[PDB]
Every structure is written in structure tokens, then in C-alpha cells.
């Protein structure tokens, strides 16, 4: 089975800054998807195929990396973006990192 | 009238980092004869403007690869790859597709 490990756990910041999110796989040569779930809402898609964007996603969301390392860098943090962020490869999900205000 | 808008207003660039100056027209600039009629000019303050990039994604007879032209219809980007001390000045975007010829508002680049 592919297992996915999210690094930072709770990443607390302030709005306006830039956060990175590093997710580590266990099988190289695949895609990646990044799911954002706010508090008490329906989750939404951000990234697929490690680089592209969903329908109606601002261009401050960008993800890169290949092999077994995959980064999701968010520039110019809003107040809405403090949510849980999920990795997903083929069926397996990460446990989810959390963004909190400072 | 067609509008030539230039982004950004002014850039303070480091020598070596790739710089980008963008300009957008009101419509596409591809003509049936086979050339894209979007141009780019260099002007020093107190000096007459000189042509840099004609028929974009092709260099002129005297400019190196420090300047580049790319983009598509209605979206034009001038890319300055390697910055020298002589790279400072005001750049202009201008169309030679239709009459009249409209110019950009001007993009100043200075030294740090």
C-alpha cells in the first residue's frame, strides 16, 4: 500500500505571509492531489497532477515537486485559507496538516 | 481606441535574476502574412527610442539573448533574462498591426 506522510502538523502563521506544505509518499513516479477542508464545510479540490489547478482557484495556490517529495506553497495568506490540507494518491489520504492564526 | 497597458509600474531588479515586463493589447496581433506585429523598444532618459525585439520569438541582428519575446494573442511578455548595468531605462510596447500606432505607458527599470 502507498502511505502518505504530512510533515508540519500544526503550522501556525499570520495573514499575508507564505506557507509551505511538504507531503512525503512511499512510491515514486505518481501524481498528487491537494484537498482543502475548512471548518464544518464540504472539502474542495486545489491541485491535481502535482501542478495544475481546479476550476475557480486563485493563482497564489501552486504546487510542485516530483519523485517522493511534493510541496504545496501558498503565497499571500488570506484569512479563509486557515484550513486543513489533505494529500491523496489513488485512494490513500494523508492525516492532514492544520493552518492556524498566530 | 485600443489600449496598451503595461505591468508593472516600475521594477527594481537585481543583476542576474530574470526580469519580465508585460503588455496587453485590445485584440490579437497575428496577421495573415505570417508575422506577429508586436514590438518592444528601449529608451534612455534624454535619448531617442531604439528598437529591441521585432517579430517576437526572433532576435534582431544586433541584440543578444538577454531580451526575449513570447506570448500569444492579446498577451505579450518581454523577458529580460540577464541584467547588466546598461539594462536600465524605460521600455515601451507598441503595435504595428493596425493604424494608428499606439504605445505603452512606459516601464521604468532602475538600479538598486
Amino acid at each position: 500500500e502507498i502511505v502518505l506522510t504530512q510533515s508540519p502538523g500544526i503550522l501556525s502563521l499570520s495573514p499575508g505571509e507564505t506557507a509551505t506544505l511538504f507531503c512525503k509518499a512511499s512510491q515514486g513516479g505518481n501524481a498528487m492531489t491537494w484537498y482543502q477542508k475548512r471548518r464544518g464545510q464540504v472539502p474542495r479540490l486545489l491541485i491535481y497532477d502535482t501542478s495544475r489547478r481546479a476550476s475557480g482557484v486563485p493563482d497564489r495556490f501552486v504546487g510542485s515537486g516530483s519523485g517522493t517529495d511534493f510541496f504545496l506553497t501558498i503565497n499571500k495568506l488570506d484569512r479563509e485559507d486557515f484550513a486543513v490540507y489533505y494529500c491523496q494518491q489513488f485512494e490513500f489520504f494523508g492525516l492532514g496538516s492544520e493552518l492556524e492564526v498566530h | 481606441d485600443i489600449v496598451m497597458t503595461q505591468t508593472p509600474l516600475s521594477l527594481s531588479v537585481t543583476p542576474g535574476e530574470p526580469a519580465s515586463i508585460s503588455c496587453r493589447s485590445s485584440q490579437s496581433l497575428l496577421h495573415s502574412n505570417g508575422h506577429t506585429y508586436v514590438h518592444w523598444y528601449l529608451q534612455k532618459a534624454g535619448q531617442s527610442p531604439q528598437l529591441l525585439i521585432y517579430e517576437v520569438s526572433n532576435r534582431a541582428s544586433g541584440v543578444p539573448d538577454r531580451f526575449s519575446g513570447s506570448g500569444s494573442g492579446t498577451d505579450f511578455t518581454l523577458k529580460i533574462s540577464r541584467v547588466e548595468a546598461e539594462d536600465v531605462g524605460v521600455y515601451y510596447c507598441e503595435q504595428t498591426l493596425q493604424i494608428p500606432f499606439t504605445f505603452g505607458g512606459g516601464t521604468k527599470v532602475e538600479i538598486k
Binding site: 500500500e1 502507498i2 512510491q27 505518481n30 489513488f90 485512494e91 490513500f92 | -
Partner: protein, 453 residues
Amino acid sequence: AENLWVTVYYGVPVWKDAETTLFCASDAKAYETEKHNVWATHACVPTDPNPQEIHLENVTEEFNMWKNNMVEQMHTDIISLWDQSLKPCVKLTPLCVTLQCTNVTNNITDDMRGELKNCSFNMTTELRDKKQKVYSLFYRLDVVQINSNKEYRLINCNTSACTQACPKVSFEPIPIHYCAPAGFAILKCKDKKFNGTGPCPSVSTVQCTHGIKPVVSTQLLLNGSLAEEEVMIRSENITNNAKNILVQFNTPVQINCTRPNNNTRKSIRIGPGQAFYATGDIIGDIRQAHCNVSKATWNETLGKVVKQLRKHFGNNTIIRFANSSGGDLEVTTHSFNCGGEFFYCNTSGLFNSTWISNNDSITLPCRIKQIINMWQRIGQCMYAPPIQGVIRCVSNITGLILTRDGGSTNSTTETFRPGGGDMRDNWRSELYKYKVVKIEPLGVAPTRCKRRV
């Protein structure tokens, strides 16, 4: 010297990838059978002898079979000429009458259930005033209960009145040679080791493909295009669970499907010149239609595909099989055609094993359905008529259509399961060698000559 000049060159070998409309080439030997006993034997083009399969030395070409076209066009037009052979045939509207059905005369045991219903109804004759009282026979998968007494109706009578199929035409597969039009070549990959994607370093150009048999089987592909040396498995991302693994194996496994009821036909007249063929009496015994494969041959073939599957999932992996967990009647079953009647078998004595890294026949109990809703369109079906006598065919199982099982645990086993699904996956076992390129002459190259004045 350095004053190089442009010289154009017309008629120069280069190609780009493209997609345009291809056409048939039916074999000329099948032209003797008169006036469309199968679809598309007068409609499209007579073939050529000895097609110029010519090698292309020192050529590599990036093939693909999953994002390939011409298996999308082949699914499109075969739907369309299936509709071409039903517009002459008789619409079967006045059969939607409230039937009255009893058990067929048979030794009704409580363990078994009635496979054939009697269903005597009323139907107009050729005169508009009189109404004859005729009887027929119907399978249990064609009648539902209108709810003392017990009166049924046809299953498709809700929402889709649909045509008969004329017994002049025949549903047998004839070969179809797809040919490119003028200005387009068809590259054929001659590599004996070639999965789905990837550069094929030995190509060859044809103008017409080899004989493709359009068959309709969901699982257990039939009658076509065995492999060269090994048993080749091929997919998209093999760590994905929604993309089928089209196994295509090397030696064929002979299947022996039959139907042993005699099933005498009779003709009920709907109106003026519109006959309707219903099965009358059945002579002999009421026996279940089945299929056979040799257990010594089939288990040996699963011994091959369990070796090549370990090349993608590592060794010491306990590979097991199962029997297609759920679905409709045409995907949980081995659904195929045989002589003009539509068998739905039960591959659950086949795909049931487990394998660790260290003369008799298997009988598959099939069942027959008469109305047919291939490709699941909204307002169509096709009442296939009965056919006389015992029906028997012999086919080669050539490839399976497996599907992995989407685990999320730290297990070792990988329970593969068969599943038909989309009908395109049958034709991707025939059109993976071929891509279609567009010949693009009129190149340009610099050399040292100038047009003198």
C-alpha cells in the same frame, strides 16, 4: 560558401500525428453471400490483395493505445451500423398486450425455478377486425408481473417499444480491414515486447490493417489476435484501480458453448406483411445452456498470467481471483453471441483460485435473454428472434479483462476480478498496434544553390 539558400523539397517523408475518418475494406471472398446477410458487405469497399507491409529501418515512434483514437471511431460507427440493420426490420409495438402465462409443461421441482414461461395472449391478425388468440414461449428474464390469477407483460413495454431483428441478417463477425485515406499512413508496431505506452523501436507502414473481428464479449475476449511470445499484460497506471488490466495470452483456450433445447419456431402474423417469430413448442428435454473449458488447459493458462502479474507486483504476493462482486446481468456474466442467440454465462467456476509463490471440463451454467439492450441507450432494445435446432459454437478465449481490488490495508493478496464495463476495451486488444499519421510533405532545407536569372 556561407551564402546558404532555401530550397524547398516536395514529396518528402515526414509525418505528424492526426485523426481523420477511415473506411472499411471487407474481404472480397465474403462478397459471394448475397445482399447483406451480415451488415456492411455491399456498403463498403472491396479490399486489395497483398497489402504493402514495408519496414521502416532506423525508425522509433512514440505509440500510445489508451489516448489513442480510431478505437473511439470504431465504437462510434459500429453503434451506427447496428442501427442501420434495424431500420428495415419490423417494429414490435402491438406485442405490448397483457399476457397470461403459466408454467411450461415440465417436472416442477421446488428447488429449481421456471426458466421458460408459456404466455398465451391476444394479438391482431392481418384483418383489423378479428383478433386471434395465439401462444408463444418466453424466458423469465423477459416477463414481469402485473400486480386469484397471474398475468404478465413484456419487460421493455415500459418506456421502450423496440424492434425485431430480421432473420435474413446475421450477427456473425466478419473481418473488417480499416484503411487510411489518401495522404495518411498507418504505422504498425512490430515489437514482440510492447506494453501500452512507450517508444516502439520497430515500426512498419501499412495501408490497411489486418482483419479485425468485431465481437461483443464483456469479460473473456474471444476469437482474436493472440500474442507473439509471452502472456502480455498491459494497462494505464497499474497502481490505479479504475483502469482495467487487459490481459492477452499466448496460447488459446477453447470454449465449447451450446444450447441443447430444440426450440421449434413458428410465425405469428401481426398485420399486413409484418411477421413475428415466436418460439413454439420445445421438442425433447428442457436443459440448461452451458459452456465448457478444459480444466487442464485453463488452469495452465492461469499459471501463465499469475507469473507475469508478479512482474508488476513483486514476488511472494499471494495472487487470488474472485467472481465480479456486483453489477448488472451483462457485466457480472460472460455475455456473448453464438449463432444468433445471446448467452449470458456465469464465470464463477473459472475465476476462483489462490496462488502462493512456491481431462475433465469446467461447466459454466449460462442463461439466455431475448430482448437486448447493448450500449444502454435510452429508447432502444432489440428482440432477437428464436432459431431452430440445437445451437452450438466453438470459440477461442484469447484475453481476459481483469480489474484489481482497491485495497487500503497492509495486506499481501491482490484479489483480481473480471469485469467488462465499456465495450471499447474489447477493441483496444485489436487496435493497439496501429496509429494513424498524416503525411506532411513540402519540407525545407538549406543548401548551396541559387536560382539563376
